[PDB]
Amino acid sequence: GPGFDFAQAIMKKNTVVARTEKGEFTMLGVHDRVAVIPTHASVGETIYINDVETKVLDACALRDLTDTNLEITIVKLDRNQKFRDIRHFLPRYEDDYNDAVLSVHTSKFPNMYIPVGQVTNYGFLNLGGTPTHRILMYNFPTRAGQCGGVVTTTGKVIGIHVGGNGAQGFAAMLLHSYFTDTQKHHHH
Amino acid sequence: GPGFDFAQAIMKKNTVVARTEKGEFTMLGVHDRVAVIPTHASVGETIYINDVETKVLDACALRDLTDTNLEITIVKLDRNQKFRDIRHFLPRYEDDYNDAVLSVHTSKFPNMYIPVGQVTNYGFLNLGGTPTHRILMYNFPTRAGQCGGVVTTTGKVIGIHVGGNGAQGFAAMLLHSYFTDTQKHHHH
Numbered sequence: 001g002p003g004f005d006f007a008q009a010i011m012k013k014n015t016v017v018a019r020t021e022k023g024e025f026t027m028l029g030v031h032d033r034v035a036v037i038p039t040h041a042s043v044g045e046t047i048y049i050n051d052v053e054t055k056v057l058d059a060c061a062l063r064d065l066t067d068t069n070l071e072i073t074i075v076k077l078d079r080n081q082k083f084r085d086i087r088h089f090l091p092r093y094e095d096d097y098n099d100a101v102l103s104v105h106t107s108k109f110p111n112m113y114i115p116v117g118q119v120t121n122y123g124f125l126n127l128g129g130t131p132t133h134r135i136l137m138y139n140f141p142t143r144a145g146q147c148g149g150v151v152t153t154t155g156k157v158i159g160i161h162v163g164g165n166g167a168q169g170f171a172a173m174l175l176h177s178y179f180t181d182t183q184k185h186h187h188h
Numbered sequence: 189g190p191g192f193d194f195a196q197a198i199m200k201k202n203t204v205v206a207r208t209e210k211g212e213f214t215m216l217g218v219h220d221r222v223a224v225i226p227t228h229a230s231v232g233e234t235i236y237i238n239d240v241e242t243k244v245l246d247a248c249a250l251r252d253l254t255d256t257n258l259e260i261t262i263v264k265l266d267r268n269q270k271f272r273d274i275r276h277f278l279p280r281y282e283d284d285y286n287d288a289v290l291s292v293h294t295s296k297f298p299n300m301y302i303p304v305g306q307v308t309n310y311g312f313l314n315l316g317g318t319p320t321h322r323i324l325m326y327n328f329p330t331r332a333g334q335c336g337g338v339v340t341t342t343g344k345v346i347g348i349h350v351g352g353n354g355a356q357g358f359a360a361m362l363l364h365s366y367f368t369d370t371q372k373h374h375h376h
């Protein structure tokens with residue numbers, strides 16, 4: 001069966017409601033004060049987190065070496081609470097998955113779970129006019145309001161929901177190497 | 189934890205999408221060709237079931253001995269498929285419950301699960317101007333589109349979602365005695 005228990009533990013301890021100029025998004029906290037949000041959320045220098053205005057200390061819109069959108073933006077937030085470190089639940093590599101759950105945490109849906117079935121390493125997607133890479137696909141009619149939703153299997157947090165076409169849903173991959181402690185680089 | 193596995197088994201085998209003049213509702217099939225739907229769905233002599241026009245052979249809008257709305261309408265449908273008999277999962281008596289799940293099956297949400305936490309035997313509710321009895325209440329911000337949604341705990345199907353006020357959700361109780369094989373009574 002789908003790993004509902006795992007999805008619930010991730011949602012309970014590692015999600016907040018984020019709100020930008022573009023609306024509300026489920027937001028996955030990954031470690032310390034670092035979280036993710038879809039790039040098309042258009043994060044600025046402040047953001048609402050559970051309706052509390054919060055400084056965005058850093059925001060990195062990920063792109064691959066072809067200079068193509070990956071649709072993940074990693075943010076560092078000025079908050080007191082640390083997120084439980086869930087980096088060990090992130091996949092090392094691209095993969096396909098079975099019996100995944102999509103989990104949403106917004107004002108409208110504070111806690112909701114959708115089994116999306118098989119998830120395929122899809123690759124290239126034209127997302128609302130933006131070429132995008134490293135997309136995961138599931139055959140489920142996902143809707144507006146579900147962006148940022150966390151895609152899991154038991155023991156793995158594999159991506160965040162970013163798009164759909166009325167029949168299929170698409171998530172941006174999360175990989176373990178996106179969040180490893182590193183060194184010195186001018187990035188803005 | 190919440191009984192997601194049980195909720196999923198009920199949804200998989202015992203729900204259809206019903207559509208009346210008032211819109212779409214999750215519809216729980218109980219046994220044979222007998223199902224339930226909230227009375228405010230305004231069931232007529234035909235109904236759409238998974239988008240297929242279907243004759244409604246009988247419809248009984250339940251009321252208690254005070255002649256007050258219970259908000260459950262039991263329907264008998266002209267379909268080929270029988271529903272798996274789930275009467276043994278229906279509670280005998282009114283009760284309070286822990287860690288319930290609300291499960292929705294509509295066109296917009298073909299499969300969605302919401303843990304609603306504690307469910308209380310609430311009693312009287314004024315439902316959109318209609319006095320209504322035998323209501324179950326949960327502290328969860330349920331929304332339009334969730335009516336008919338099935339409320340479960342492990343091993344019990346306890347009600348169907350009928351209402352909310354933005355902070356709380358309300359279900360009409362299901363009791364085992366609503367569906368027992370009986371005898372001869374002019375009811376229309």
Ligand SMILES: *[C@@H](CC(=O)OCC)[C@H](C[C@@H]1CCNC1=O)NC(=O)[C@H](Cc1ccccc1)NC(=O)[C@@H](NC(=O)OCC1c2ccccc2-c2ccccc21)[C@@H](C)OC(C)(C)C
Nearest residue numbers: 022038040041126127128142143144145147162163164165
């Ligand atoms: C989540 C964010 C949101 O609700 O918007 C607020 C600004 C939302 C989820 C999806 C909406 C529809 N169902 C969903 O699962 N994502 C988007 O709207 C996303 C942009 C975005 C905005 C903000 C944050 C993150 C993302 N855009 C779309 O999902 C877009 N879909 C899309 O481009 O799909 C690709 C299609 C494609 C590729 C190749 C050949 C043919 C097609 C095709 C045909 C028909 C439809 C889509 C595609 C949505 C907005 O596009 C449609 C046309 C479905 C409305």
Ligand SMILES: *[C@@H](CC(=O)OCC)[C@H](C[C@@H]1CCNC1=O)NC(=O)[C@H](Cc1ccccc1)NC(=O)[C@@H](NC(=O)OCC1c2ccccc2-c2ccccc21)[C@@H](C)OC(C)(C)C
Nearest residue numbers: 210226228229314315316330331332333335350351352353
């Ligand atoms: C499901 C059916 C649907 O979507 O409508 C299509 C016709 C829907 C679910 C609920 C909507 C809001 N959140 C939900 O969970 N149910 C209804 O709309 C239901 C009527 C119905 C129509 C068709 C089938 C089955 C049912 N009506 C309401 O839910 C109504 N809520 C309500 O009456 O709550 C009682 C309130 C009460 C009692 C005593 C003191 C104070 C109050 C109070 C204060 C403020 C709000 C409600 C109540 C909705 C429609 O009413 C509001 C005002 C929330 C819009």
